[PDB]
Scaffold this active site. Structure first.
Site, PDB file in Angstrom:
ATOM      1  N   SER A   3      36.753  55.880  59.246  1.00 29.62           N
ATOM      2  CA  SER A   3      36.083  54.592  59.147  1.00 29.62           C
ATOM      3  C   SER A   3      34.615  54.749  59.517  1.00 29.62           C
ATOM      4  CB  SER A   3      36.745  53.551  60.056  1.00 29.62           C
ATOM      5  N   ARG A   4      33.743  54.100  58.744  1.00 30.48           N
ATOM      6  CA  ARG A   4      32.310  54.172  58.999  1.00 30.48           C
ATOM      7  C   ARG A   4      31.865  53.253  60.127  1.00 30.48           C
ATOM      8  N   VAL A   5      32.675  52.255  60.483  1.00 32.05           N
ATOM      9  CA  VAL A   5      32.294  51.346  61.559  1.00 32.05           C
ATOM     10  C   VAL A   5      32.559  51.968  62.925  1.00 32.05           C
ATOM     11  N   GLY A   6      33.592  52.799  63.041  1.00 31.69           N
ATOM     12  CA  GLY A   6      33.911  53.434  64.303  1.00 31.69           C
ATOM     13  C   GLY A   6      34.639  52.516  65.264  1.00 31.69           C
TER      14      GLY A   6
END
Lengths: 128, 116, 43, 57, 267, 204
Positions: free
Chosen positions: F170-173
């Site tokens: 996931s790019r949001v983390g």
């Protein structure tokens, strides 16, 4: 100068000893300084090695061949060499009771193997 | 050597040769230990660990993630610090004294303040 | 590439033919010992 | 003992005394010791490249 | 050489590289435990057999050929382990081809049957799996089909001279008739009434077999680690060459498929 | 839920399961089977995103599920090939990457000055044989901020569902998660990554 090397570990290894008393086939022989050449078989007794003073280490050997070289060297080659404090009194009574009941109860090598195990267990239990 | 000079080309070739030999010897150090080597291989492996962390300096915009101050090393200060470590002038220093530092002056101040 | 679940037997080359011959040779030797023991213990 | 009348030599007499002394000691100190008295090796005497019955005691 | 054939060859080569790399790491952990057994067997061979060096025990004339014992393993994938053991025993059998051979493994018995099948008198299987102990060496010495009726008894094995390579060495074993006929055999106080000459040869047979099996297992494990590292390195070069061919075939398949749709739409 | 490319029996079975668990009262269903024309299936992604954008512009949250992304690309290329237009790669038009990026960029999180709403986009990319670097698979993974991979080998072993931890990210983390679950997920990520690389030693 002793060379008590077993088939799994080394006890004496280097020459840094003085006196050693190991039970042979005849009697309880004991090596001193410049020992004579005597290659007798070792029985199932206690192999104590006195380190200068009273720092002896009692090692219960299972039997081997105590070789004495002519250059004041003692090579005690044994199969098993354990101390007297590494044995239990409750577990030693279970092996001696099972070997006495199995002796003279069958045939083949079952009755002959029980007689040798009962004699070795009685000598180790009396030296506590 | 015809664009950066003979002094910058010798420092770049020496740092690239020590990093390439330490990366290829990583498969043998995990199977034979670190004490089963020669005298020349033991000295080159110790200097390669401190040289990999000396080139990683903390930026000015990354001060909120690491906690260290931003170091801006110039071109003349970076070539003089790498040449002194490969000659044996900083062989007695620790491996953690060069991490998160930049320049030859930052390695001497961090090594003396780590122990005392 | 990815998904290497059984890629040796799915190729059909040198490694694929040797894997099927090794499994058939071990199953043939074990079937002779199981059939001989069942005949002697049928009653 | 009287091991000369049977088929027990010096190799079989030394292995029987070492295995009996290890089993009669401490039960908790038997770490890395049970493998030295148990083996799954077999012996098969050959003749001419045929062989006889495989024995393993 | 299509897209489906290149994907099956690349996926099968990747699984062989992971199995070869995992086997090399497992061989390094097994080499550490085997080093303690090999070092302990070397100290026992210099203390228990120290009486033969001071008495100068040697053989002389041949008594009904001799006896050979090739100690090896039953599994493969160890490089030139079985090839070096079979080449050393075949060179010494040229001057005495009437001697018997006792193979202690499936790898040594397969190579010896193609050259001297009549010389094989004993075959032992199942010894190359686990490590050697005193129970396996004492059982093979007592059931060697009259091992004391020979003049010379050799033990062919592989001695690990280093921690990467090895060499096939040999160790002679004297019988009961040659132990009492030494030069300085009467220097020590030995009981002539009890078993002293026969007990020295029987105890030396189990000790020499245990030392040769411990040195042969460490040399085979060290040679297997070098073969596993070479197989993993060779698999990486083949995967890199297959990736370059798969990348060129993927770009050519997209250009060939787009040219067919553009030709039919323009006509 | 925007069912595009599915059959008539698949849309009726999914709507009956959500009504039995009290989940169809606040869920929009965009029926778009493959038995209709190519214009209805290609415009199913744009019509479903316009109806779900009314809740994000008012103060509520939405979640769009474009099932599937592979069926929407086949409907757009069918209408362009019949309109006398030039094709490109994999028999697609020139605006292949712009057709999927324009419908996925509208589902974003607004600020406090716009209302405070957000919209989630769950596009399902139906791959061929596990190849994630294809033509339509590479365009949807590069425009989205994360992708959940699903392999067919892990589903038959016992992992339900088959979600590869080494391929999905996931790019949001951890910025869009709860604080109670972030304390236990920090130590579990390092233990799961170390056990995957040393999983080959389980046979010995």
């Amino acid at each position: 100068k002793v060379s008590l090397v077993a088939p799994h570990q080394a006890i004496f290894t280097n020459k840094e000893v003085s006196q050693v008393n190991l039970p042979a086939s005849s009697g309880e022989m004991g090596v001193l300084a410049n020992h004579v050449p005597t290659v007798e078989e070792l029985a199932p007794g206690v192999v104590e090695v006195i380190e200068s003073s009273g720092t002896a280490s009692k090692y219960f050997v299972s039997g081997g061949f105590a070789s004495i070289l002519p250059g004041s060297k003692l090579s005690i080659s044994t199969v098993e060499a354990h101390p007297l404090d590494a044995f239990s009194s409750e577990n030693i009574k279970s092996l001696l009771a099972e070997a006495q009941k199995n002796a003279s109860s069958a045939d083949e090598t079952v009755a002959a193997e029980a007689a040798i195990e009962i004699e070795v267990l009685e000598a180790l239990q009396a030296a506590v | 050597v015809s664009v950066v000079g003979q002094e910058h080309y010798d420092v770049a070739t020496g740092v690239q040769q020590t990093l390439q030999a330490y990366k290829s010897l990583q498969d043998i150090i995990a199977i034979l230990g670190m004490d089963e080597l020669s005298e020349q291989d033991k000295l080159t492996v110790e200097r390669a660990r401190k040289i990999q962390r000396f080139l990683s300096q903390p930026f000015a915009v990354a001060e909120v993630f690491t906690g260290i101050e931003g170091k801006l090393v110039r071109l003349k200060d970076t070539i003089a610090s790498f040449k002194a470590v490969l000659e044996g002038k900083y062989d007695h220093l620790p491996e953690n004294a060069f991490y998160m530092v930049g320049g030859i002056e930052d390695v001497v101040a961090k090594a003396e303040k780590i122990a005392a | 590439v990815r998904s290497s679940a059984g890629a040796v037997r799915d190729a059909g080359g040198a490694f694929g033919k040797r894997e099927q011959a090794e499994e058939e040779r071990y199953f043939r030797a074990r079937a002779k010992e199981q059939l001989a023991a069942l005949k002697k213990h049928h009653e | 003992s009287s091991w000369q009348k049977a088929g027990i030599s010096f190799n079989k007499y030394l292995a029987i005394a070492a295995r009996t002394v290890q089993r009669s000691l401490k039960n908790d100190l038997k770490v890395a010791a049970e493998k030295r008295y148990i083996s799954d090796a077999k012996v098969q005497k050959l003749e001419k490249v045929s062989t006889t019955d495989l024995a393993s005691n | 050489a299509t897209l489906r054939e290149i994907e099956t060859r690349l996926k099968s080569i990747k699984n062989i590289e992971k199995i070869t790399n995992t086997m090399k790491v497992v061989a390094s952990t097994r080499m550490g435990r085997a080093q303690r057994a090999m070092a302990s067997s070397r100290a026992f061979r210099e203390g228990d057999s120290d009486f033969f060096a001071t008495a100068e025990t040697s053989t002389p004339e041949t008594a009904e050929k001799t006896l050979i014992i090739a100690v090896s393993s039953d599994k493969g994938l160890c490089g030139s382990i079985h090839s070096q053991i079979a080449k050393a025993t075949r060179a010494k059998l040229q001057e005495t081809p009437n001697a018997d051979v006792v193979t202690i493994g499936d790898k040594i018995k397969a190579q010896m049957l193609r050259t001297h099948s009549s010389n094989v008198v004993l075959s032992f299987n199942g010894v190359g799996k686990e490590a050697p102990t005193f129970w396996e060496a004492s059982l093979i010495a007592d059931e060697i089909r009259k091992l004391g009726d020979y003049d010379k008894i050799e033990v062919m094995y592989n001695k690990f001279v280093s921690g990467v390579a090895f060499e096939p060495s040999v160790f002679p074993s004297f019988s009961p008739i040659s132990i009492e006929e030494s030069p300085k055999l009467s220097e020590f106080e030995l009981e002539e009434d009890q078993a002293i000459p026969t007990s020295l040869s029987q105890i030396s047979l189990t000790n020499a077999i245990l030392n040769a099996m411990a040195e042969g297992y460490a040399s085979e494990i060290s040679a297997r680690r070098n073969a596993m590292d070479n197989a993993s390195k060779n698999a990486g070069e083949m995967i890199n060459k297959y990736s370059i061919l798969y990348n060129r075939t993927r770009q050519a398949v997209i250009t060939n498929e787009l040219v067919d749709i553009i030709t039919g739409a323009s006509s | 839920y925007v069912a595009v490319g599915q059959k008539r029996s698949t849309v009726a079975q999914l709507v009956q399961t959500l009504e039995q668990n009290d989940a169809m009262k606040y869920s929009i269903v965009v029926a778009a089977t493959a038995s209709e024309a190519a214009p209805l299936q290609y415009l199913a992604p744009f019509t479903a995103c316009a109806i779900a954008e009314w809740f994000r512009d008012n103060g509520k949250h939405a979640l769009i599920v474009y099932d599937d992304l592979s069926k929407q690309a086949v409907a757009y290329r069918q209408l362009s090939l019949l309109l006398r237009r030039p094709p490109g790669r994999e028999a697609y038009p020139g605006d292949v990457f712009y057709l999927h990026s324009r419908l996925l960029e509208r589902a974003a999180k607004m600020s406090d000055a716009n209302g405070g709403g957000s919209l989630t986009a769950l596009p399902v990319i139906e791959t061929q044989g596990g190849d994630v670097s294809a033509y339509i698979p590479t365009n949807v993974i590069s425009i989205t901020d994360g992708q959940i991979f699903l392999e067919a080998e892990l589903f038959y072993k016992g992992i339900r569902p088959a979600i590869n931890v080494g391929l999905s990210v996931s790019r949001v983390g951890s910025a869009a998660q709860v604080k109670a679950m972030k304390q236990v997920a920090g130590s579990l990520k390092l233990f799961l990554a170390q056990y995957r690389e040393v999983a080959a030693f389980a046979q010995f």
